[PDB]
Structures are given as structure tokens and as C-alpha cells.
Amino acid sequence: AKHHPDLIFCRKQAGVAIGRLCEKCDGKCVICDSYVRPCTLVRICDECNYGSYQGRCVICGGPGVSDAYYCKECTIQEKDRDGCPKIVNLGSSKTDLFYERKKYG
Amino acid sequence: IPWKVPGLPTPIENMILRYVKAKADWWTNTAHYNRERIRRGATVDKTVCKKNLGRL
Amino acid sequence: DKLLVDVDESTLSPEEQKERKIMKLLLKIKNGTPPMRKAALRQITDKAREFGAGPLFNQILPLLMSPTLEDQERHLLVKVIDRILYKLDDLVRPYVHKILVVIEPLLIDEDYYARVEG
Amino acid sequence: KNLPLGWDGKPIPYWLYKLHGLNINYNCEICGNYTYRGPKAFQRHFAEWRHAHGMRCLG
Amino acid sequence: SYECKLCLTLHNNEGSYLAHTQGKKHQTNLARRAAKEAKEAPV
Amino acid sequence: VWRNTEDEILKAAVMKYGKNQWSRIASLLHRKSAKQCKARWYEWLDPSIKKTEWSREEEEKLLHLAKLMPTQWRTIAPIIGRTAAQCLEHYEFLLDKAA
């Protein structure tokens, strides 16, 4: 997302499987990282919906609870045409916070 | 803490020392007396206990 | 152990040995406050190519071989090895087999995040 | 000694002299082979009276 | 924010500004401003 | 440790407030305690701390004393007018250049 530049997206061909977000992350656009005006639905790459990953939070990786949408901006500038936005790197943040957790308590 | 302000007309300083000596001696003697009360048990109080501790 | 004694930098005429000395900033990375960690990590990321692979790995890998590695220390060292890997691109070609000989265990271990990292 | 003056009234640090290119000399034939010190003085001189007068003498 | 008109430097805290006044930068600017001013006056 | 900014704020705060309310003062800077302010002021900051090198006579006195009254630095340091820290390290330094 716009906030950790170390993150990556799948960027293969979109498909027909809709994308879902955890209850934790829910309520936002995936890219413009805002919280408003959902216009259109997300679609994800075939691999990025294969396997156990049926119904996972694109971002948080967790349980699918709702649908994932696109802000009015991103759909106006057509940033919504770059295929799977599935993030195929976990990122340092989750790792480090879990590690400090295991240390502390 | 030695209080020594130099420019004072010596007779004025003489007065002030007479008076502070009076007052401090009164302070002491009342401390002697309250502590004797408190050791004799005579009375209670939540102030004249903390006050006397401080003075003593 | 080197860090215990002291000697002047010029007298450390083996300027590669000077490099090694200042490289033992690794200890600051390993143990040290969050700010020590951040500053050290930037130091090493950007002086990476200046240091070069040989010294870096020859002084990193022994750590990772430590029996007394705890968790934090380990994930920290893998963080660095990653960042320097992103700077040194080819220079690792001589050092691959070493890198694997140490990373491999992360592939088979009960931690999840350790597997995904390695 | 070997460096120019400033509004402080004393010479400039030798690295400032090199950084501003004041160690580079540019000659202008139209100005009577006058030597300008550094790129800024040599860019300004095209609008200065000496160059304008040289151009006027050439018609 | 706090500005030194002699050095054209910005200072965030009042602590930063007082520490800037004791500097090779501030002091040398103060001393240069000093000597120049003195020389610069005139039946 | 202390940074020059905290140091300057200390100077000003003291000269304003007088030497007696360290609570207000330490309330001012973050990550500074009233005990520390008091200690630092009397140790280093206060103007009466004489900051020069040791005379030969001062070192004569120091050495002689630290031989007279072993390891009592807060007893000595008033007698030669420096802090316990100055007396201590400087006696260490004389002892090391001797040996």
C-alpha cells in the first residue's frame, strides 16, 4: 500500500474470484488506502485464490469477512486494472511485532 | 545556612538578631514541651505529631 | 573479542582490519536500544558495497552458527543479511553455499514466521 | 591572501572558493579579453555594461 | 520557530536557540559583525 | 547523560527560579529528574566550579590529602575547591602517569 513502500502486489491477470478482507482491515480501499466511497469490486489472480487461500484478507492474510472495494479515485484513474492486488510479501511489520510479542509475553 | 547580607546598618542588624534569637528559642522550648507531652501519652493529634516530628 | 583491546586507527594500517573493527558495529545491532539498532542498520545498509561481501559474511555467519542464538537476535541478523543482499547483487556468487548452509534450517522449523523469512 | 572579499570584510574559506568555481577563469573577447572569475560572474556579464558596450562598438 | 538574523539559521526549541548562540557559527558571526562595525563608523 | 540544550535550559531556569525549587525546574525538561538537576548543577554547571588545570601546589595538596584521608573524596574536594569527580579522576591520572 501507499504506506509501506516495501510491499508488492501479485500483478498477474485478474480473474473472476472476488476479494475479501479481514474484519481487522475491513472498510478501506486496497490501494488509495482511504476509507470512503467504495465503487467497484476487487478481482484476484487465479493463483492468489487457489488453495487454502479461498476467502482470505488480501492485506492482513486472515479470515474473509466481507468484500473488497475500490475507491472512487482509483477507479477514476483506472488504477483498478492492474490485476491481482494480492500482496505476495508478508512485510517486516507483522514479523517484528510478533517477535517482540513472543519476547515480552 | 549563614545569612549574612552585608549592607545593613549594624544597629538594624543588631535588632534583627535580637528578635530572631528570641523567636528561635521560643520554637525550641515549645518543641521540648510538646515532645514531653507526646511521650507522656497525655494527648493525641494528627498535627502536633507531624509538626513536632519536623521541628525535632 | 577484538573490541576489548584498543588501538589507534592509523596504527591499524591494515585498513581492511580497520573495516573489520568498525564492522563490529554488529554488536550494537545485536544488543542495543532501538535507536542503536536503527542507526546501525542504516549505517550498514548504505556502507554495504563499501565494506564488501568477504568481511561482512566472514563476520556474520559465525554468529548465526551460535548455539546460544535466541529468537530476536536471529530474526535481526536475517533482517540485515537480507538488506545487504539487496545491495550486493552479484558479489555473493562466491558466498552462496555458505549462505545456504546457515539459512536452510529456517526452512524446517516450527516457527511460522521463521519459515516464511528463510 | 589568494582569495576574494565578502560582506563580512574578510576572505572566504578556500573550499567555498572552489565550490563556487571562483578558481575557474572565463575570458570574453567582446569585453577586451577581460577575465571573469567563476560561472556566475561569467553568466551575469552578458547583461553588464562592459559586454553591452563591446556589442555597441561592433554595431 | 526561533531565527538568528545574523546567521540566517532556524532553531526549533528555545533550548536549541540558546545552544546555537554559543557557536563557532554564532560567535564567529558576532565577532566579524563586531570588528566591521567598529571600522565602519567615521567675537 | 546531559546534552547542551538541557544544559542551557538549566542555566536559565536556575537563574530565574533560585536554587530551592527543583520540582518546578525538573518538570520543565522531559527525561530529567529533580535529583539529577540538583546534582548536575552543584557538580558541573554552577559558576563556582573552577574549571582549569591543576597547579603544582594544587596537586601537592591533593596527593598529600588523599594520602591523609583515604578514599574520602567528598571530604577532601571542598578543601581543594573542586568536585569529587575532578579530585577523583585527576588523582587517578596523576597515579597513572606515575606508574
Next chain:
RNA sequence: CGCUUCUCGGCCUUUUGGCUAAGAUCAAGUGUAGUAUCUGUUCUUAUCAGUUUAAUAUCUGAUGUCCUCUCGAGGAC
């Protein structure tokens, strides 16, 4: 007219009600990423050649031929 003293007008200074146990008391979240500002510290070498740069810079390297004096010097070239 000179001296001196007093009266007043124009006015360029400081100016919280005290005692008590200095009345009593005396707060800081964490992490990940990046920038800015101060404090600090340092370049006079001459060419040439190279590297590199938009241009410097940087960085890299070396200090016409012969003799001799002590990088300098004299002469036959």
C-alpha cells in the same frame, strides 16, 4: 548683580496580607519506516593524464635531456 537656604510647578527609579510540617504534593507509552534543523569536525598543490560530472568537483595516478651546488640553483645544449 553675586552668594546661600526654604515653597511650589514640569517630572527620566524601585513598589501582593502575613504565618505554618522548604504548608503538603509533584506523569514521562511502544514499535516500523523516512526527512528537516542545530551542536560538532575538515580541504590552499604545481601541473599533466585519467575517471566521473550538466559544469566544477571528486577520486585516481606521476613529477625537454646532461653535469654539479645546497624542491631550488648555475651553465653547455
